[PDB]
Point group: C2
Chain length 255, copies 2
C-alpha cells in the first residue's frame, strides 16, 4: 500500500548541548498554526505524521498568533513525547510586534505559556529578540529571570533566538542554547555554531530552507549538518508531503 | 494522514495528437523494471498502484529495457484497461542490436502483445539508433507499423528519435514523436512546434536532466510548449513520484 514514509529520523536523535535533551535533527515549527492555517484535523495529522517520522522537537512562540493556545489541546495524551521550545519577549498586539523584556512580563509570559500548553514545565524557552540581542542580554531583566524560572523548575533550559553573532555568543556564556539563522544565503552566524561546538552548548538552526541559486532542500541540509555544532533545524512546512520529503532529505544528508 | 497524495493529475488528461488517446501529462517509465537496483515485484505493483491513484494512465516500455515488457504483463493483469501502453520496435548480450526489417518489426510486436498479455498496444514507436531519417526512408519498419495499425494490433505508431529531421518525417506519415526536451537540450523544439500546428502527438523523454525546485522548472519549460502531450518520468521512488506529480500539477495550474 503506501509506505512512502520509508526514510525516518528515529535513529538519528542527537543531544542538544549539555541540556540532557535528545532531539530529532528536524523540529516542527508552528508559526503557521497561528499566523492559510491548518484545520484542527490537518494539524493533528501533521503532528501524528511528524511523530511516526521520528520527530520529537516542536517550536512555538507567544508571537505566533495562537500557535501556543492550539497546541495545548492538540498535544493532550502525547505531551511526554515532545521536547517543546517556546519564547518570551515578542507579543504582536494590534497590527505590529511589541517587545517587553521586563522580569514581570517574562514571568507572566512563561506562566501563560505553561497554561496554554496544559503542562507544568517547558523544555526550552528562548529570548525572542528584536535584533538588539546584546543590549537585551545585558541591560534588561529577561535572562536572569529565565535563570530563576529554570531553578524553580518551570523551564528545563533557556537561551536566545537571536539575529546577531555577538548576541548568540553572549547567550551561550550564561545560557544553554542559541537559535541561529544558517542557510545557503546567510552564514554570518557560523561563529556562534563553532563556539557552541567547542563548549558543549545547544544550537538550533532556523530558516535552514531559503534560497537564491541537486535538490535545494538537500543542499540546505548538507550545509547545515556539515556544522558539528548543530543539534536540529526547525522547518516551517505544513504540507505533509513536503514534510515527508524534508525528512527524507535530512536522513540522506546525515547518511 | 495518508492524503499527502493531495495533488493529482486526474483532471489534467490531454489528447495525444489526433490518435484519439487521452493521456496524463506524466507517463511512467519502466526501464528500471527490466534494467536496459531493480524493483521487487512488490515494489513494482505498489509503484503502479500509486501512479494510478496519482492520476497517471500512461506507461512507457520497450523490448530493449531488459524484461520490462515481460514483467508488465503479469503486473498489469486486472488493470490493463486503465493504461495507455507505449512500446517500441527495433532495438534489442553485451550491446545494442538494431533490426528495422518488416520480419523483425512484425515479430517484435507479436512478442510484445504476448508478453503484455493483451491483443493490442496503444502506441508503438520506432526505437532509433540515431540515424532516424535513413531508417524512416530506406527500411521496412514504418510501412510495416502502418500495416499493423490497419490490422488492429496497434492503435498508433511513431518515432522515438534523436534528430530534428527525423522527428519531422515521423510526423508526416506517422502519428507521434517522442523527443528529448529539457533545460540543457532544446534542439528538438521545431518538432514540437510542427506537431502543435498539425494536430500530432509529442511525448517528451529525459525531461529531468540538468546542469525554485528543479523539477518544477523543468516541467514549466516542457509544458510551456503547447505541442507536448506528456513527459515520461523514470523514477521508482514513490515519494519522488508523488512529488513529481505535484510539481506537474502546479506547472499546469
Amino acid at each position: 500500500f503506501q509506505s512512502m514514509i520509508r526514510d525516518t529520523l528515529h535513529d538519528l536523535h542527537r543531544p542538544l548541548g549539555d541540556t540532557g535533551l535528545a532531539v530529532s535533527p528536524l523540529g516542527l515549527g508552528t508559526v503557521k498554526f497561528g499566523r492559510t492555517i491548518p484545520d484542527d484535523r490537518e494539524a493533528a495529522d501533521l503532528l501524528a505524521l511528524a511523530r511516526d517520522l521520528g520527530i520529537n522537537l516542536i517550536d512555538t512562540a507567544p508571537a505566533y498568533g495562537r500557535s501556543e493556545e492550539r497546541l495545548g489541546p492538540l498535544l493532550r495524551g502525547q505531551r511526554e513525547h515532545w521536547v517543546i521550545v517556546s519564547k518570551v519577549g515578542e507579543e504582536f498586539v494590534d497590527g505590529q510586534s511589541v517587545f517587553d523584556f521586563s522580569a514581570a512580563h517574562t514571568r507572566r509570559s512563561v506562566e501563560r505559556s505553561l497554561k496554554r500548553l496544559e503542562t507544568d514545565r517547558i523544555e526550552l524557552v528562548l529570548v525572542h529578540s528584536d535584533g538588539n540581542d546584546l543590549d537585551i542580554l545585558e541591560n534588561s531583566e529577561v535572562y536572569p529571570t529565565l535563570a530563576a524560572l529554570k531553578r524553580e523548575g518551570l523551564i528545563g533550559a533557556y537561551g536566545l533566538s537571536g539575529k546577531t553573532v555577538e548576541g548568540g555568543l553572549r547567550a551561550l556564556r550564561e545560557g544553554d542554547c542559541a537559535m541561529v539563522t544558517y542557510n545557503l544565503n546567510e552564514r554570518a552566524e557560523r561563529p556562534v555554531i563553532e563556539y557552541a561546538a567547542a563548549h558543549a552548548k545547544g544550537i538550533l538552526v532556523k530558516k535552514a530552507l531559503a534560497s537564491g541559486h541537486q535538490d535545494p532542500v538537500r543542499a540546505s541540509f548538507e550545509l547545515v549538518f556539515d556544522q558539528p555544532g548543530v543539534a536540529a533545524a526547525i522547518v516551517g512546512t505544513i504540507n505533509p508531503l513536503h514534510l515527508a520529503h524534508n525528512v527524507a532529505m535530512a536522513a540522506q544528508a546525515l547518511k
